[PDB]
Nucleic acid binder design. Sequence first.
RNA 1: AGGACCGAACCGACUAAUGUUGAAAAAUUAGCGGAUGACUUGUGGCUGGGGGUGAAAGGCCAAUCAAACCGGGAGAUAGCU
RNA 2: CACAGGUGGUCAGGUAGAGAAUACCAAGGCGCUUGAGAGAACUCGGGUGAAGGAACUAGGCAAAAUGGUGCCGUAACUUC
RNA 3: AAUUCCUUGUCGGGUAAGUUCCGACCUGCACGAAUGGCGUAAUGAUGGCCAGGCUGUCUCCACCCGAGACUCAGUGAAAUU
RNA 4: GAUGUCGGCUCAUCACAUCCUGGGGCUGAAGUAGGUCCCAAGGGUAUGGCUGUUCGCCAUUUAAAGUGGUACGCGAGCUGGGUUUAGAACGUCGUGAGACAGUUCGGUCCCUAUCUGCCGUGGGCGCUGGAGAACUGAGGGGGGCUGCUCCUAGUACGAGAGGACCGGAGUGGACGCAUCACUGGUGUUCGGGUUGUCAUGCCAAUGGCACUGCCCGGUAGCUAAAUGCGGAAGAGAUAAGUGCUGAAAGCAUCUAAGCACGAAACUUGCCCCGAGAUGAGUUCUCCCUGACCCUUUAAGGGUCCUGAAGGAACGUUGAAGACGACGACGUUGAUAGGCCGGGUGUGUAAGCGCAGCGAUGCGUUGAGCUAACCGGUACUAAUGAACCGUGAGGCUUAACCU
Lengths: 114, 209, 26, 56, 122, 120
Amino acid sequence: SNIIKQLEQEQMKQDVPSFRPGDTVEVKVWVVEGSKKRLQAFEGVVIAIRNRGLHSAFTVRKISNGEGVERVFQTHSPVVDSISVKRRGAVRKAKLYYLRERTGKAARIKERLN
Amino acid sequence: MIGLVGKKVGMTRIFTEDGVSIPVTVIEVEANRVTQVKDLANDGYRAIQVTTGAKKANRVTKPEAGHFAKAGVEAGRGLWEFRLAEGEEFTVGQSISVELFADVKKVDVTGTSKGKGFAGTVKRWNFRTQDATHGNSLSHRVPGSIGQNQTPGKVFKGKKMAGQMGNERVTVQSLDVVRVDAERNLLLVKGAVPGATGSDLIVKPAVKA
Amino acid sequence: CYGGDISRKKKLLQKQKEGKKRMKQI
Amino acid sequence: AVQQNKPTRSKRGMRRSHDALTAVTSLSVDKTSGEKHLRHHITADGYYRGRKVIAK
Amino acid sequence: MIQEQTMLNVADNSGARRVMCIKVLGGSHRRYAGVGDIIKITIKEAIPRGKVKKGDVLKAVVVRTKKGVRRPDGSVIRFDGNACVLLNNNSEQPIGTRIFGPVTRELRSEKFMKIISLAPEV
Amino acid sequence: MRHRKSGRQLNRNSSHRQAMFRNMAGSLVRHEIIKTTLPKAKELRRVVEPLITLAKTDSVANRRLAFARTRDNEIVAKLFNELGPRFASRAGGYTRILKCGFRAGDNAPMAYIELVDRSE
RNA sequence: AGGACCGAACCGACUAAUGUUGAAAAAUUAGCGGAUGACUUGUGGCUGGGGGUGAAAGGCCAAUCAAACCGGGAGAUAGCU
RNA sequence: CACAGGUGGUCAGGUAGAGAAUACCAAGGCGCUUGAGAGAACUCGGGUGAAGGAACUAGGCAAAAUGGUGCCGUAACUUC
RNA sequence: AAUUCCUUGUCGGGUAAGUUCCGACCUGCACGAAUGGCGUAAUGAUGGCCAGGCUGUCUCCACCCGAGACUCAGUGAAAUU
RNA sequence: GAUGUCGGCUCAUCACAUCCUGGGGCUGAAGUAGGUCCCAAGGGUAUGGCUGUUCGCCAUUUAAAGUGGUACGCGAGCUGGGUUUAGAACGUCGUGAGACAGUUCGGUCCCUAUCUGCCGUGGGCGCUGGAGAACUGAGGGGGGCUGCUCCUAGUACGAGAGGACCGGAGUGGACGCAUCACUGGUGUUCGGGUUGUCAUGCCAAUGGCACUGCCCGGUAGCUAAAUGCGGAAGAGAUAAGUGCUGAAAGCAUCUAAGCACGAAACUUGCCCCGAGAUGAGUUCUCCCUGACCCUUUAAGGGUCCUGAAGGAACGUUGAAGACGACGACGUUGAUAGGCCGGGUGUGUAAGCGCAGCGAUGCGUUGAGCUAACCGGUACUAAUGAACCGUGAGGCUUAACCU
């Protein structure tokens, strides 16, 4: 509906890379300790997918320090800052939830390399 | 003082670029021209009678089109009165608009709640559920005992029980006006106002400080 | 149960006391 | 639960005030073939608004 | 949403290992707790050398939570495993001297300076 | 509490519904006219017309779906060969409803439903 | 080899849900126990009411058992209603 | 009662399976003698459930789970 | 203790906390040797207590699919009064 | 002449002899903390372990874990654990049948609501010509809790330790209201995966059946654990309490004349219902200006012409709905379905080609399919008519006007 639209289209980043699930993306979110506003990196396999427009967001699982983690990101939020697809992946399944259950040697995904 | 009469269109987030996701409810606010200006000399009290967005002429009844035939042009979907205090406003469709709210900090919006149509206990007044098992007999969700044994001898009036729910009125109070906007007539309130999308809204500056 | 009979109760209190006479001195 | 006393004929009648049937109001007709019919319905001939649907 | 019962892992040394919540401090009736809440604790397994032992009672600042935490952009951390940092019952101030695993930025505060000063991440 | 849903239940489990509209729509596309209780007819538009729009253009895959549903070679052949082209360019609205009204056997409302231009 | 073992028909009756003017004057649905034996069952046979029969609960004997059913004494008697 | 009950014997197909279990189908026979609309509580029968996992309660009642074969391996105790 | 009234007997184990449980003392109100005593591997739709697993039992309910309830046509009852 | 008894569950309500919050006196009250008493019923009042338990002990809380009545509140609302049925055993008593406020194990909880009450929702009629809107608000209900630091200020008090009064800001818990944007749940009406089997002549490719066959993801909607908001401030008259002036009583004396302060209670302030408020209120607009006859001659009865606004009906339907109701649209039309484009979801269809002995891979290919959403489109269906609805609308009294 045109009644919205005008709000949403002016509020979308257009530069966001066309990332695909299972891409080993690295995201550099902003963080403010207080005065400082330094970046923080966050490597990981993608597991979810966006697709709502301005509301679109994507999830990233990682495994770190012996403790697995996950973190959604609002695609058009300013805090996300830089977003690199890094290493690619291929999975042929829109939501890689079954990875939450797996680990180690079985936890790998292989390059599309086409 | 007077608020205006709008039309909920249904929710969106907006980012403040310093870095926070503020939810907001979008509201079209077509200008609300007055139709009559009731006062003590008019037999009554200070008030204004405003109409709003366009309605087909063919539905309009003769008494109505005649009521708009005086003063203000072109009938809207309906009418609403609003109270006054030292507010001088002519009967001419002065077309009060969105920009009036720019001074306001917090507001109201009085909606029309979605129709549940049945309630019953639990969904309505949030009565607690009885045991789902350990032998419960045909009472997994019944209202339960509703009075004392005999010396009242009656169920008290005002008892909480099953019945129709929602679809009434209920206001909101507070609500930051995250963004007044003209040339478009949009009102970005800080989220969550009663009523299904496209329902009429009756917005006023908050009586609370 | 209470019943209201007199001798039906003092037996019980007699037991309750008779135990305390032992349990105290022990 | 069952009654402790016998309700009166006046009471049963009061309970039956709303049982009354409703009138069909204005019965409708085709503008071509004769035929009275329920409005928004096929006439008994099979005519409806002039045109003859249902050959049989 | 650590709530009553609910086994909790330890994220520090001191060797409590498996742990169990038994109360949710935060006034009357408060139900769920997490992120950076304080809760009561009874130790289960505990290390044989033992900075502490089985049947001990303690307080703990929950750190990681499976249900995570949000913060304004709408991002939601979701650690896959529960954890808490042990505290002395009166002095507060965790009795450990190490912190395993990631911790939330949300945990950050005045008196938790002690905890986040340690900890490998965030 | 239903709001904004679309899908009549018609007092049957989902499998029975799907089988029912299957046999019924086959009967419709076959006989052109059919007589049925009104809610079934209004719920029949939604099933039938999309098949014809599917049938508006021949291709092997289109026959594979048109046969994949209804599961009847004579009618899927009857589309594409015949009822396909015959709707050369109508936007839609292939079917009209005509309420004859009120079956005597249980006083259920009735209506014929038919392809838009059976003509004869 | 076996009053062996897991498990259908076959016999049984532990739990719960219904059902309670039920579909049913004892059943249904999901489970459960026995299942080569102190089994299970068809067909006829005999034991008779202060007697039968009883791996004993005072149970069972034609939907009823601390004394069956039908008829007779019989208009038993009733300081009671 | 045109009743979800009771009634002994013989016959015993195709594929899966240890089988007369079971699933699907043959020969064969059926749709159970009120229907039709709506899609609210409540009841009944089930499907799924974020975090927690007996905190429920008289009690883990019910529900959920384990569930097949081949091998490797198996305790306290004993009347072997 | 299927025996113990006074009794939530005292001490130990188990639990964050244990009127039940397991262990021992003897002050056995009123156990005891064929109306058997004390042991017992196996066996139990048996009594009580614990633990892993698992789950809507629960904090706290939520949504969906079927049969009722609801509206329409035809048949059309009942306890009671 | 069967009013079926502790306890637990859901659900409550009222009293004040008040545990908390609020206000005062007094103190063996420096401060903080206390103590006892006076006033006060607005709101609040814990999870567990053990036992059939209310109780009690205990673990850990909390601003606090109020006492009582309500058939020892509450079984035509639920539970049957205790307790008072028949089986059984122990201890004990009796020679015996048996008995035990002594114990142990196993034991059928019925009802379709006529009336009273209660939560909801309609039909009639009245409100004095009729109708369409909007209000006015008598009266009524809803809501009324509180922690925690920081500031004031390490300040008054104290030697210290310790540590405020009044006054602000911020931020939590419990609770209610509201809502799908976010995060998630369900989504048997969307797509793929897969076993067993049956069918479509067969290969292929698709369908049925097995709980949706077993699953994996998921739109709309609905929803909480999601995110928005909420108690108040102010004003009136007040209790306990303190007072100013001051007589009875040259003094005194808060009081008898008088005069002023004084708390979550009271009445207002926020929300919602609300003119059946039969006292039926107010305001705006709209429609009706034709005849004739009989009398018992009065709010009379007919008959003829007349049918306005509006209403209802019917049809397509709704983010409204059990049924009616309320909302939208009905050809000058986007109400629904259809069709068109997107979005979204699923994850590389089919076909053909290529590799391999074969499964399978690869290319065509981010391909298809896509429910409930949006944006458009008259393609189908919302009919040209009737039916209900009247024809200027009482008497008297006054004031203006003839």
